[PDB]
Amino acid sequence: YELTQPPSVSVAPGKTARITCGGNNIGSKSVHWYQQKPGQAPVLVIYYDSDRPSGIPERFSGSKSGNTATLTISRVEAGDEADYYCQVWDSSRDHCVFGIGTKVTVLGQPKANPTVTLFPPSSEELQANKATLVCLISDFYPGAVTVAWKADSSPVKAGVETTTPSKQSNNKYAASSYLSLTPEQWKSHRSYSCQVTHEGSTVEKTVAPTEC
């Protein structure tokens, strides 16, 4: 037995989002819904077709029809960005079945320009004969960003690793980038910089081996 869902649902802030779940004449069984936000376990959000567990906002409601079961979220908040999964039990084979899941994204949130923080190697790490520059980019939206590193205003590509952006508790985005270097390389240039490009504009931070 199979449970189908749309792969994604887009919705504007405050609008209503609807996530639908079709299965083998579901309507004969009972549908349950789970919310899973990035990096967390599922939480039950609706059970028994339309019941709200203690602690879930009223704006979460569950409905059903003939071949489709629906989860509705009124007044959608950026905080409701999540993957949602319907679920039923198959009483003949005695098997639990999940839908494939629906990723809900609320688009048209306010633009936020990034803050960039750049940490130089710690003396502790330099004393272990290593060196890592750490560029943390926070409080930005939308999510797309590019990072470039420079030593004395010349580009660096070796030794760079950068994470794809992820939501913070704010619902704004954050990302990180590392430049790995030997202690010698760190001390051999006058400065290093991390430049972030977001929505056509850039923010650059600079660190120097000679400032503490």
Add this chain to the structure above:
Amino acid sequence: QVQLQESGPGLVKPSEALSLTCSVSGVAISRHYWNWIRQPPGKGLEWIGYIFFNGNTNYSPSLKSRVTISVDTSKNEFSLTLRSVTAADTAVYYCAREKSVVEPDNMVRWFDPWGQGTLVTVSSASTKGPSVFPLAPSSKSTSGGTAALGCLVKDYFPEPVTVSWNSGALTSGVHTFPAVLQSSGLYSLSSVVTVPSSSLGTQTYICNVNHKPSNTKVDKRVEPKSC
């Protein structure tokens, strides 16, 4: 309240057996059916099976041949064994409490609550615990009223590491970034917190790094940098 907590090995070599345990608080095992679910990274939820303390079990068709679920009432625990793992078995494994109502001729069964999940990585590579370094606040990581400070967590395997600050007492302003996978096959990540710049001379900041795959915990003091 009812809490569930999975514990696992972190890393499992191909063809060997995965063993997990779920410890239950706040209710007796004998009062419910208990389930295991899993989720491959990037993918969906897949039920594994259930158990009841009198011996009843049913397992997923795909996994029936390789799965054993068991129960230990004397420790209020249930467990999962999955033999002969391959890379397809790398996943977050969740335990969950089954809730059920008796409706005629049918089954209404759902899960409330779930545990936190534990990542199992199937790999021939060896475990490696992290090295942790401070990201010290300085006159250049400040933005007026606040300063950012952090911990760099380097060169560990497998995922995941989790980080708390001041033993969980400090939650406001915390962000732990996803890991990078380096060319060496090792992961690194950073956790940062923003705090009053006023506080830096008179408040202690400690990052608590946990790498359960290596049974390692590191509590690293992060102090203002003094040149």
